[PDB]
Every structure is written in structure tokens, then in C-alpha cells.
Amino acid sequence: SEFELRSRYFIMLCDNETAIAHAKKTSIWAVKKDSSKRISDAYKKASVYFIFVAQQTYNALGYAQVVSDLNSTELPFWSDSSHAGGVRIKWIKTCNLFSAEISEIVSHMDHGSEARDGMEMMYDEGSRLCTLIN
């Protein structure tokens, strides 16, 4: 890649139409409090990608590089008390793609059960998902 080290990858389960549509236009995402510390820690040590999939269906909506650390005062309008702060993103792919393999990876991402929003995935999973979304 353009990077020295492997990237780290996080899943964003999208259940808010305004949010995802706005993020594709403004290149900012609101990071949930449960997952923010891990994401911020990761951003300090590695290139970080967010992989965005639709909740339940697991259609792939795109993937983006995270290009700023968590900022408690730079948040999109649609954020709420569930969020810690905002991060800027750089979209690599934007799409609306159903793939059985994408869905299977997301369905088994948490020790063989369905992905938890904001979780870090394994390298094999993130790299495969970005390959499938390219």
C-alpha cells in the first residue's frame, strides 16, 4: 500500500440513512463512545480504514481511510450522545453492493457471530472485504 505497515480495519454498521448519505458528501464520521478509544489508539499507530455496511443486510456501502484523530468538537450534525467525537475520512470506494461473501464475513466477524458495530476485524477480514468492494 502507500503505507509502511499493515492497516487496521473497523466495521461501521449503518442503520441511519441521513448519517451515511451525509458522510458520503462531507467525509466526516461520528465515532461511538464504545469503540472510540480503540479507534483513536489505532490511528496513532497505524493507517486505519472504516468499512461501511448496511445493518442486517450487510450490503457494502464503501470504505474510507480515517485521516484525523477523534475530535469531541468536530462532529457531524447527526451525531448524538452515543458518540464521543468526529473523525475526518477519505473515501476510497463508495457503492451499494450485496455480496454473499461480504455478508458471510460480517456474519462471522465476532468469534463466528455477527459483527458488533465499531469493532476491529482481523487483517485477513479487512483486506478481503476491501478487495471485494474494489
UniProtKB/Swiss-Prot annotation:
Highest taxon above the source species: Eukaryota
Listed GO CC annotations: chromatin; cytoplasm; heterochromatin island; Mei2 nuclear dot complex; nuclear exosome focus; nucleus
Alphabetical UniProt keywords: Nucleus, Phosphoprotein, RNA-binding
GO biological process, one term: siRNA-independent facultative heterochromatin formation
Molecular functions (GO terms): CCR4-NOT complex binding; lncRNA binding; mRNA 3'-UTR binding; mRNA binding; N6-methyladenosine-containing RNA reader activity; pre-mRNA binding; pre-mRNA intronic binding; protein-RNA adaptor activity
Domain annotation YTH: ranges: 7-133
Effect of inactivating the gene: Read-through transcription of regulatory lncRNAs (long non-coding RNAs). Decreases premature pre-mRNA 3'-end formation of ssm4. Increases levels and cytoplasmic localization of mating and meiosis specific transcripts during vegetative growth. Decreases heterochromatin formation at meiotic heterochromatin islands.
Compartments where located: Nucleus
Functional description taken from the UniProt entry: RNA-binding protein that recognizes and binds N6-methyladenosine (m6A)-containing RNAs, a modification present at internal sites of mRNAs and some non-coding RNAs. Functions alone and as part of the erh1-mmi1 complex, to recruit the CCR4-NOT complex and the NURS complex to target RNAs. Suppresses the meiotic program during vegetative growth and promotes the meiotic program during mating. Binds to DSR (determinant of selective removal) regions in meiotic mRNA, and recruits the NURS complex to targets.
Subunit structure: Component of the erh1-mmi1 complex composed of mmi1 and erh1. Interacts (via N-terminus) with erh1 in a 2:2 stoichiometry. Interacts with rrp6.
Name of the molecule in the record: RNA binding exosome specificity factor Mmi1
Species in which this protein is naturally found: Schizosaccharomyces pombe (strain 972 / ATCC 24843)
